Curated annotation (Swiss-Prot), chain A:
The lineage of its organism: Bacteria, Pseudomonadati, Pseudomonadota, Gammaproteobacteria, Enterobacterales. The gene is rpmG. This is Large ribosomal subunit protein bL33. The modification N-methylalanine is found at A1. Coiled coil: none annotated. Belongs to the bacterial ribosomal protein bL33 family.
Swiss-Prot record, chain B:
Residues 1-19 are annotated as: Disordered. Pfam families: Ribosomal_L27. The lineage of its organism: Bacteria, Pseudomonadati, Pseudomonadota, Gammaproteobacteria, Enterobacterales. One of its GO terms (molecular function) is structural constituent of ribosome. One of its GO terms (biological process) is ribosomal large subunit assembly. Coiled coil: none annotated. GO terms for cellular component: cytoplasm; cytosolic large ribosomal subunit. Belongs to the bacterial ribosomal protein bL27 family. Part of the 50S ribosomal subunit. Cross-links to the 23S rRNA. Cross-links to the A and P site tRNAs. This is Large ribosomal subunit protein bL27. Signal peptide: none annotated.
Amino acid sequence: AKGIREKIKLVSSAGTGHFYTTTKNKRTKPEKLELKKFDPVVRQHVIYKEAK
Amino acid sequence: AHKKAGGSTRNGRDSEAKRLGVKRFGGESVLAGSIIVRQRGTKFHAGANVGCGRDHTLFAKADGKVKFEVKGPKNRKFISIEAE
RNA sequence: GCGGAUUUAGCUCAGUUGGGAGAGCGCCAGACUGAAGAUCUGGAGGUCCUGUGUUCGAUCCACAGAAUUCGCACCA
RNA sequence: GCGGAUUUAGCUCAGUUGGGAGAGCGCCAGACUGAAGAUCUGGAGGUCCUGUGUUCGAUCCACAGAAUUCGCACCA
RNA sequence: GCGGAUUUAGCUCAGUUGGGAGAGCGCCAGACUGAAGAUCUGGAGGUCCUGUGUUCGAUCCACAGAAUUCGCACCA
RNA sequence: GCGGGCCGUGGUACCUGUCUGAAUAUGGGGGGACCAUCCUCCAAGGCUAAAUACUCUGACUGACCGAUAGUGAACCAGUA
RNA sequence: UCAAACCGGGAGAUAGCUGGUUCUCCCCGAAAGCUAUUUAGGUAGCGCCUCGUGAAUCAUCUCCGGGGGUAGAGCACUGUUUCGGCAAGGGGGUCGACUUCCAACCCGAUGCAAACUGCGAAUACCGGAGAUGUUAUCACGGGAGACACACGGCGGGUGUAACGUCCGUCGUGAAGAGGGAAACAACCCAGACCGCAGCUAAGGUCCCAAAGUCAUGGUUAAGUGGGAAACGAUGUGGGAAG
RNA sequence: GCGGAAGAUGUACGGGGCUAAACCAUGCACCGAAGCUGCGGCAGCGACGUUAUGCGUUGUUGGGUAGGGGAGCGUUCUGUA
RNA sequence: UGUGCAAACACGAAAGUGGACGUAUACGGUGUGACGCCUGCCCGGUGCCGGAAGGUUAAUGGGGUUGCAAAGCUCUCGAAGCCCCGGUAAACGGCGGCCGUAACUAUAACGGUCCUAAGGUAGCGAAAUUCCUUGUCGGGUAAGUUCCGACCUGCACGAAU
RNA sequence: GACGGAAAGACCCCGUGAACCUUUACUAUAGCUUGACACUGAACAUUGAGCCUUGAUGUGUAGGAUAGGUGGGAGGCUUUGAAGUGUGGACGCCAGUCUGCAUGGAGCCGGCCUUGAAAUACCACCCUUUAAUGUUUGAUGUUCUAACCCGAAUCCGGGGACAGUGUCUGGUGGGUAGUUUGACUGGGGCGGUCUCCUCCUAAAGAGUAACGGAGGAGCACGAAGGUUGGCUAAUCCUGGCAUCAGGAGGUUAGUGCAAUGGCAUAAGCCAGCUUGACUGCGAGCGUGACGGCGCGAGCAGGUGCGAAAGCAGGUCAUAGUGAUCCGGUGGUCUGAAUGGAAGGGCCAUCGUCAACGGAAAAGGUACUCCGGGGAUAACAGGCUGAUACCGCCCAAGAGUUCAUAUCGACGGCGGUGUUUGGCACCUCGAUGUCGGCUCAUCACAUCCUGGGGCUGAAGUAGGUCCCAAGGGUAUGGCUGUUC
RNA sequence: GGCGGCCGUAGCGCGGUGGUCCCACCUGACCCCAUGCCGAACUCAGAAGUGAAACGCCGUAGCGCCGAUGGUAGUGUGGGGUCUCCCCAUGCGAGAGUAGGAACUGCC
């Protein structure tokens, strides 16, 4: 479960979209760097950022 | 880590494979049969495997790969009803 | 009877890469000491249970027999 | 016979990041002491049970065998 | 999962004056003793959990993460 | 408000126990949640006829049973 | 009466536990798997009895278009293992040549395998057409039994073993007459209305016993007519060869 | 065919008994089943005709535990004749 | 071992009650159980009791955050008892293995070496409490896994188990 | 003898049976201690907290910085109520100025206002803290006093807010009570196994068991993902085991993972670049109906890379997983009437059950009973016979020499079934156990004697073997004991 | 060498011979263009020198693969005996052995 492990659960943040996105991230650098462009159930081409 | 104790395979379960696709009636462009996954090439009836031979027939529909290196994995050249 | 262990130079015992038979003690001698003692050094002392078999060659394999010891087994 | 544990330098034992073999004691020697004692320092001392297999390389993996120990089984 | 405490040189720990990193023990050396012991003196040994931020500068502020420990929760 | 019982009673039933504690009809309660605004009705006092039950007793009836049947008991029976 | 009273009372307590369960005749006539269930000697949807409804053309005993690889065979993984020849390495004896021994490789003869192969069945089996069949196959829905087969022989697999677990073949107990085999669950032959006639099967056919002391040919002489073995034999007969 | 083969109150193929009334290799005729065929009397299923599961004809014809289905008669009382 | 008593201890739902028409040269709760010899090694691991820096220890109220209130999240503050250390084995208990010296051989005896602290000297011990054990030596008997005496490393005998 | 009649075993197992006592079991109920609320009032002392008033303002080492603080410095022009000064005092502990005190030199204000070791003026923010005082208040200890309890007729005495006690919470708690804690299993027990993937076994589809023989998964990873360019490996040989150059080399390398299958101008290696693990909705696949989940294959709209076709629904494919209730996370709907909150669902993801289709948590039972079952062992019988007993074949060797004249190894082939281990169809709806004893009935693989075979039989004396019951097998001490 | 047909018996090894027609090697890298380190790759240019590696032809069948003529063991399938076991009928026939093809064909 939660603790000191590579994989980590964190939802995205398209901004105006309805969020919803599952993507883990281990501890090997980079750190403060989510992913990239995503297309949530809303307008085409919206901001990303899985970090939170 | 490494493997040891020589031998053939390694025992499993009950084979899960069938043989759908009469290919003598209506046939939508899809996998004709079921045994092993991943394979392309045949776009129509191309039943051709080492032995006495193989065959299929009638069905006008572009593309229609097989399962894999099994029931005629080779890719022949077109075939349909008789006058679609 | 059955099962296990043991059976190497006087004594007590080590010794499985199968191809060196060895140690302690004891015995004799040397060195030392006035000398005897004890250390210390040297030498001698082995059908390494017996036969047979296995191997190029076996104390150290296999088999059979004998002895010792223990457990077990059974008495009008 | 069955299963578990154990089988590292003389003794008692640590040692799993697989790639250093180590500690205490003992033995020899140095030092010191008139000297012997005891510390202290140094060295020697280990087929790390055996064979084979696995890896680039294993004491530290796998398999087989042997020994020790315990529980169990057998015993007119 | 939630909350508290803890996370300083090998070990055990002090250190909120934000601006000295320190003590005991241990280790090495010196002095002493014939010597060894114990005192005693001296030296070495600190990514003071980690990152970032706040300040002129922080072990000693704030935030985030991790370790250890305890209570609690779960353990169809 | 605290601790319980009980109820179909759900934070929205009723009641008991401890503690606290209003206003007052220019007032207050209720309409199955809480608080200000509608509708209805007003507790913390009391009384109140009538509409079904059983079956000892009397009578009647029953396509009920028939004296190892039926009430244990048609003969001294709840007696021997 | 007590490791716990008596009587009656709320018990005709609850049980996946045992037993019980009675008239005639006629037709047909089992099984021992899966998913789930407080479920496993219980049901429901399903493998199997029966009845009603519904749909629709096969199915399979055949043939035709596919998939598997076991038996066997061959020779094959691996780990053993027979001989000879050739080449390379190490050790010992004498000469830098040769001889002897050991391990690995290749070839031929020899061959090896519970985890293989240059080759290779039977066979079961998916999909589509026929002789046969024409309404069978197949589609739906209701009500069930049901997922505790076993034993003997043969061949096994696990098993260091007990009146097994678990597979395979066959055969019976099942749902079998009649009948012979002396008797007999399964060996052989062959399948039940009544009364009756004829002819056959089982088997038997000299007598009790009903049926030929029947045909052709031969053997044994042992009365063998039936337990019998690893082993021995000028008992005897037949055949080939120096 | 034989040697390898010793044990239990009376010994033999069902018996008598048979050189075949044995046994082995064949074959023929009969007795012998509720078998097969024929004369007088059935059931279930399906087909034809039919309102009919009533008849006629036609193919199969008839063993059975557990179990399924169906017919039946003995019986009491109260209807209507 | 508990208790000066409106006591300890015990009975009852309550009211009350047994022991007290008693009172510690009392009574209640237990072990041992006579008499005689007695009496050695260890507290590393429970129960009870006492002390105790620090750690653990609800809700209301109080503080912070959250929300124009309220939920929620969180902090701070906490008796008796307990963690803390110690005493106690007439507390439940634990007492394995090895080498040397030394003997014709085996054991006992003594010291050490190791493990888990000690490893057992009084007595007496294979004893109704030791497997191995019909243990070893021996009495006794023609012979006795019986018995008695001794040794005794004491598998799983040993101290008011 | 009719496995006689009859009185349905206490041994043993079974039957998710009963009871008992008892642990380091669960859940609760008395009782004890204590805090607090109602029964606990007054006086004294201690500690914490809130509020008010009063006084001062608590922090530390050197000119480029002064100083709560900080960044700007040092003898720089204009502030409240007499004290500022230069040598003068206090109530909680340390400094700058303030008041009714008392006065001179220090100048009138001022001090103030450009020295390194002694240094600058104006209105929210870490102090905003600390120290003292008054009021309200929480906890602890002491004294006194009305309740309460006991003794006494009463007066009154003793005890004393300890209490007595009611209620509740947390901890401790054998002092008390239940096998509830599954199964398989060469009886049972000990030892080994119940989820899942992948050979052999499964006997050529399929499907198929056993504590069946072999071996593993419960994770890891942004890359071991994708694309492109170049390249192609093990291993062996030669020159220098690391490297480099040449040759041989379908490949035995490698490709994340237990194996099979696939692959080399490659899905392998190296390098660069880049990142399709996108959204929505259908058809198909798992004999035979059955969900989640998975996979192959389209369509509609759109992300990445490539010229493009095309490739992705994670890592070549097959193990790495798990419900309901509840809680934590993302848009809406929902309760006389309205606002502010607390509450109640659809889809999906994450967190735990690895005795892993899944309970929150362990144990004895000889006083036994009852309803059943062979689907449960310890004996006797039966099969087998590895063990056991005995024989045979070949025969080394021993035997002074001499296999074969006793003895007789290695190896091979058999008989008996007295021994033992023991594959559970027979009896546990039960032929109660060993041995002995006593009593009745039916047989033979024998020591002496008798008749014989071999001889390590010269003779004698012996060894071994066959035959034979005809007669005879009659006794004690320890132990319940059988050998 | 050019240009066609048939079009997996053209898998894979190996031999002879010919055309300065053709073609790779080779040679040279001024430039287009290009190599992470190397015009080796990539790309461009000229042709001194051969045929040592193409191509045209043509000679061996090793080995792979595709066909054909002959047949024992093995095996499909149903009855017979027999202690086991074996036999018969019938459809084929392990594997060995004898051969076929290394291109074929038109035109300049």
